[PDB]
Amino acid sequence: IFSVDKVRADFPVLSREVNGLPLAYLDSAASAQKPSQVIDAEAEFYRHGYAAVHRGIHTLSAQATEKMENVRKRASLFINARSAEELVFVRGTTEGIDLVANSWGNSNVRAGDNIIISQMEHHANIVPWQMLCARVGAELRVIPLNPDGTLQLETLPTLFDEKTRLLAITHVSNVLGTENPLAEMITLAHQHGAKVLVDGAQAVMHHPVDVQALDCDFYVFSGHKLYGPTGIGILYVKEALLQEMPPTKAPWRFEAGTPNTGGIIGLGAALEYVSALGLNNIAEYEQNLMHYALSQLESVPDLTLYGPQNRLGVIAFNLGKHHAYDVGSFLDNYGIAVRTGHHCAMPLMAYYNVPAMCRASLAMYNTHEEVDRLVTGLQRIHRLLG
Amino acid sequence: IFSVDKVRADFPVLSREVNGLPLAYLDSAASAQKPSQVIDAEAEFYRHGYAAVHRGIHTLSAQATEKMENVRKRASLFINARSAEELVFVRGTTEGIDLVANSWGNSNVRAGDNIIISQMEHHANIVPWQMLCARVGAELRVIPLNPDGTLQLETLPTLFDEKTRLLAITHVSNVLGTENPLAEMITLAHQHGAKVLVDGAQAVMHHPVDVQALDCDFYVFSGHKLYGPTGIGILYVKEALLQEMPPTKAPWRFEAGTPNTGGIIGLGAALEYVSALGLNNIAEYEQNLMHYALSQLESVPDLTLYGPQNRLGVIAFNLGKHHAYDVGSFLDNYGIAVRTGHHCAMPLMAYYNVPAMCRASLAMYNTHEEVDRLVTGLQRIHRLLG
Ligand SMILES: *Cc1c(COP(=O)(O)O)cnc(C)c1O
Ligand SMILES: *Cc1c(COP(=O)(O)O)cnc(C)c1O
């Protein structure tokens, strides 16, 4: 069983004070805090094993290359890829998606074709497809939202046709916490010969992810949101699709310039740390924390929530008519870190006819007590400003 | 005055053993070792100040944004840029050059134009221009080498004309250690309205670099070669050239996706560390170490050296008719790390009619004693295999 107090003890930032008050870090969806096992694994590599990694002759370089390829293998097991060679080290989810849009998109999407995204996508899964469509004269189509923050699945027959080359879809919305029915959507897409890229940046820390079971063609996620270092992400490419991506041999073709070995070592340690805790244990604790928060938040007057009741990870909200920026500033003044703004999801904001929302993340190291501070803080803000 | 023993004490890898023997790390040009001030600055950020950085409302996010912008300012002072906003955080020199080739190259190089590179360039300063030239139907022209590893400057009048849009040139050759006459070459290039991109990845650790005095239009270098973390480099863009680079406002337009704040913090600490030592002190010590090495190497039979006598940082060599790979393996078997292969400079190898060379780097933490081990090792290898 999960013990949040033991987990929290691994994270040295969580003891920090902010504005003289104990930090309540509810912004893990923007970036997660890192355990000392991750911090120290990277530091130890720099301290005792550092070298360049291009199968250099000498010992440190050869040992560092092997360390990096062992992390690649561990990442492929983490997402149940068939082969370690299907995994590409990228700088982040943003770059991984862009890499696919140029390497695969440029030679597989032609004039008169269409690409399907959704109205809940992060900008990182919108802009590369907008650019590709303008480059080649294709059409970008958008699955719309329901008020509850789920996709209007009934619109799929009007969007998928013989010229649909790609579906690019978020696994979990970074704003609403909606989890999309990927397996079923992928079956549909493949019936038309379309490939599927999954943006999984908000999925891989909340429960197991199996790309063989999903049968997705591309899958991308971010190291820094998986309790890992910045500057490193993972792009999964189904080995079959390398024949559609013209250029040495794969993974390494897509890793030009010096690898971020520091970040790779830390990412490996983060996968180990998460696996040692167990993703199903994490899921169970976070789901219970989420249910406690949504129940307590019922007692906040004039609170508006956006998204489905079964959200993962994040709670998007606005308080009365107060601007999200001001709600966020008051919460920060209490030592509570939430995120405000458009969350790199302006089409989603436009759908709800707001310019901005507040967002609280509830991660595996957050507590019922921190939820209580958020609830109390929102009540205080409402009294003081209403 | 420089004390190499005090410097070496800051670098924990240098006490490492390899093949049971004390490491002699002569491969800093591939990647440099890092002092604990750099390692710990990054670790400390992760331990006590970590957050996302998009001017997020809350305190940690705001303080982290300010940390990253202070590193940007420190980097601009380090290279004497006019304004911190002229500096772009990139993933590395490879990506920084590619960024210029697409952002500036695509909208300033047209059919029938030409771009000038040199025969000593790293592939990172060749491939983006080859690609751009094929995209737009321009011509790629190459300044050839002299046997001594210097540029054939007399060929410039046949290469520069009214259609020359860009000169892309290495500050210091990663193989030969040749330092090119940038200031003069930049005057010539600007007389034809051509811009100049300088690849400075092997320059910025050896002596001061002043982009205002050079008047270069772009300048790029790598964090991991400047005693800093991996996954981070610097691209300098003369502010005037942002009008020629169409798209928010600059530096930040060219930094999509999450910044590598871990790497940025470590890069700042590396600049501080290098500045505290003093680049002129470093230059003086490395020049004396180099002169000692070239003098001692005279006593190695059948040694071939490539490059000018006034090289910086690296000594490229081959031993008799033995393959560089085998020379490198014997040296590694003695605990001495050199690099072998084509060094990402195949046109340079082809000019010298060899497939590969050995390369020893002599950095600020290397010693006369390590030079003696290299000399002894080469004599031993020659006896044993001749
Ligand atoms: C954060 C995020 C991204 C961007 O990921 P980076 O690694 O920062 O580039 C893309 N998509 C989603 C859903 C995200 O939450
Ligand atoms: C190492 C090097 C590069 C590549 O730099 P990265 O930061 O590894 O991408 C480019 N040019 C020269 C001269 C180099 O030495």
Residue numbers in the entry:
A (entry chain A), B (entry chain A): 2 to 248, 268 to 406
Per the authors:
SufS is a pyridoxal-5′-phosphate–dependent enzyme that uses cysteine to generate alanine and an active-site persulfide (C364-S-S-). The SufS persulfide is protected from external oxidants/reductants and requires the transpersulfurase, SufE, to accept the persulfide to complete the SufS catalytic cycle. The β-latch contains four key components: the α6 helix, a glycine-rich loop, a β-hairpin, and a cis-proline. R92 and E96 (E. coli numbering) form cross-dimer electrostatic interactions with the α6 helix of the adjacent monomer, and N99 forms hydrogen bonds to the backbone amide and carbonyl of G251 in the glycine-rich loop.
